[PDB]
Amino acid sequence: AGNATEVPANSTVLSFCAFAVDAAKAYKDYLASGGQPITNCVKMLCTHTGTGQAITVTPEANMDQESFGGASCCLYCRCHIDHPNPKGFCDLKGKYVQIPTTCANDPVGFTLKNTVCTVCGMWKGYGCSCD
Amino acid sequence: NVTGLFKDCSKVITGLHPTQAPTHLSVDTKFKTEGLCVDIPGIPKDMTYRRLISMMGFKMNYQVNGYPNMFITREEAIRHVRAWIGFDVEGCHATREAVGTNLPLQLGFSTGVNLVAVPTGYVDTPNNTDFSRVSAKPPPGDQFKHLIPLMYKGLPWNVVRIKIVQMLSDTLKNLSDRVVFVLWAHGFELTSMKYFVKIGPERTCCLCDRRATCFSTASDTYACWHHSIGFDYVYNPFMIDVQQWGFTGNLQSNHDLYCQVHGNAHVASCDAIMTRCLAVHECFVK
Numbered sequence: 001a002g003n004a005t006e007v008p009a010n011s012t013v014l015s016f017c018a019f020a021v022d023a024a025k026a027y028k029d030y031l032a033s034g035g036q037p038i039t040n041c042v043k044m045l046c047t048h049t050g051t052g053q054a055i056t057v058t059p060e061a062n063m064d065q066e067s068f069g070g071a072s073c074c075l076y077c078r079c080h081i082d083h084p085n086p087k088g089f090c091d092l093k094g095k096y097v098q099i100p101t102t103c104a105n106d107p108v109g110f111t112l113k114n115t116v117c118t119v120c121g122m123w124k125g126y127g128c129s130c131d
Numbered sequence: 132n133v134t135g136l137f138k139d140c141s142k143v144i145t146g147l148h149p150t151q152a153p154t155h156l157s158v159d160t161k162f163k164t165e166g167l168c169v170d171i172p173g174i175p176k177d178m179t180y181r182r183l184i185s186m187m188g189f190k191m192n193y194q195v196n197g198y199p200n201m202f203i204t205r206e207e208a209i210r211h212v213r214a215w216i217g218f219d220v221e222g223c224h225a226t227r228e229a230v231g232t233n234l235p236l237q238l239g240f241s242t243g244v245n246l247v248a249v250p251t252g253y254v255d256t257p258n259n260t261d262f263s264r265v266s267a268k269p270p271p272g273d274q275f276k277h278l279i280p281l282m283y284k285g286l287p288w289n290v291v292r293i294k295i296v297q298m299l300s301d302t303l304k305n306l307s308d309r310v311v312f313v314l315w316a317h318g319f320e321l322t323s324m325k326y327f328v329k330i331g332p333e334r335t336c337c338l339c340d341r342r343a344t345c346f347s348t349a350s351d352t353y354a355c356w357h358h359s360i361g362f363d364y365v366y367n368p369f370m371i372d373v374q375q376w377g378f379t380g381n382l383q384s385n386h387d388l389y390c391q392v393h394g395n396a397h398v399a400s401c402d403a404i405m406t407r408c409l410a411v412h413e414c415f416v417k
């Protein structure tokens with residue numbers, strides 16, 4: 001009974017992060033010890049003529065990005081663990097997330113390590129027009 | 132190729148919207164085309180779902196620098212016999228709004244302690260994962276009838292995990308710097324550990340040079356068995372599955388080959404006492 005959500009290539013990394021005190025540090029350490037990034041994310045087909053903003057209602061990838069389903073790029077959603085936000089809610093689930101094509105092999109790791117500019121809506125260092 | 136880890140146990144016929152699905156497998160078929168997914172204008176997200184996610188099927192076979200192995204060899208376990216705590220869990224089944232997973236009900240230890248938990252699961256919602264009470268029933272059959280009264284004697288998990296840490300600390304503080312859980316057919320015991328164990332690099336206590344055996348979510352601090360009062364999680368425990376040592380047949384038949392003083396009283400603590408007893412006779416007697 002039930003419907004699978006996961007593939008065996010992700011069992012080890014998700015188990016490790018599901019038990020960690022610090023899941024983000026565990027994912028970073030897992031990659032540094034030679035582990036594979038989390039796969040089975042929700043990658044979208046789009047026209048690559050979007051705004052390029054980081055977190056959006058519909059896919060907004062520009063020609064330098066890919067669009068993904070937001071929950072699928074969130075380590076806390078993937079491991080079914082608590083989110084770090086004060087109220088424990090997610091800022092990616094229910095949105096699409098644009099990820100630079102150069103980083104699209106590890107969308108979960110990308111969202112863990114990067115920050116969205118609140119003024120322009122683009123990723124700091126990957127599109128932000130403020131600095 | 133799929134796994135049962137994080138299986139969606141809800142009875143919802145359809146899959147999820149692309150922005151809400153944790154994975155490509157869990158996106159509804161209506162969005163899948165040309166090897167990937169598409170956003171479909173006019174097809175909205177679901178803003179009221181509660182989907183039970185199964186915690187059966189963890190695989191602790193990682194090799195990450197600075198993080199200790201949870202499962203240890205028979206040789207390492209023998210050196211740490213003073214840290215041995217038999218552990219067994221009797222579960223209840225998800226029912227009603229979900230079906231297809233086991234939830235911890237009676238947690239038993241070789242100290243003779245049985246703790247009863249409210250049936251609690253990991254329920255995905257549109258905003259987070261809600262660790263919450265879920266509908267459940269004991270498995271059917273006369274061998275499981277003793278679990279029926281336990282469905283209404285459970286304590287919330289925030290209370291149960293404090294009691295586990297206190298019991299382990301009281302038992303082990305003058306015996307070992309660690310715990311080695313002695314298991315038989317470990318799958319469900321490992322699923323139950325998700326509710327009260329955290330892992331990470333080896334740490335030292337917040338009040339001494341001893342290794343940390345406990346963690347507190349109140350202060351994000353680490354403690355040994357001596358300084359863990361009020362701590363809610365077991366940190367970096369070790370474990371071994373005795374069934375993997377070559378035994379055939381059930382726990383009781385193998386336990387009874389060496390011992391006669393532990394009659395089967397059909398309770399989690401009794402299985403935990405028999406598992407530790409069997410391991411002790413196999414490693415240290417004759």
Ligand SMILES: O=C(c1ccccc1)N1CC(O)C1
Nearest residue numbers: 003004139144145146157159
């Ligand atoms: O597409 C899915 C699905 C849901 C959750 C996880 C994986 C797949 N479903 C159609 C219905 O039978 C359930």
Ligand SMILES: [Zn+2]
Nearest residue numbers: 074076077090
């Ligand atoms: Zn999330």
Ligand SMILES: [Zn+2]
Nearest residue numbers: 117120128130
């Ligand atoms: Zn900016």
Ligand SMILES: [Zn+2]
Nearest residue numbers: 336339355358
């Ligand atoms: Zn200490």
Ligand SMILES: [Zn+2]
Nearest residue numbers: 390393405408
């Ligand atoms: Zn015995």
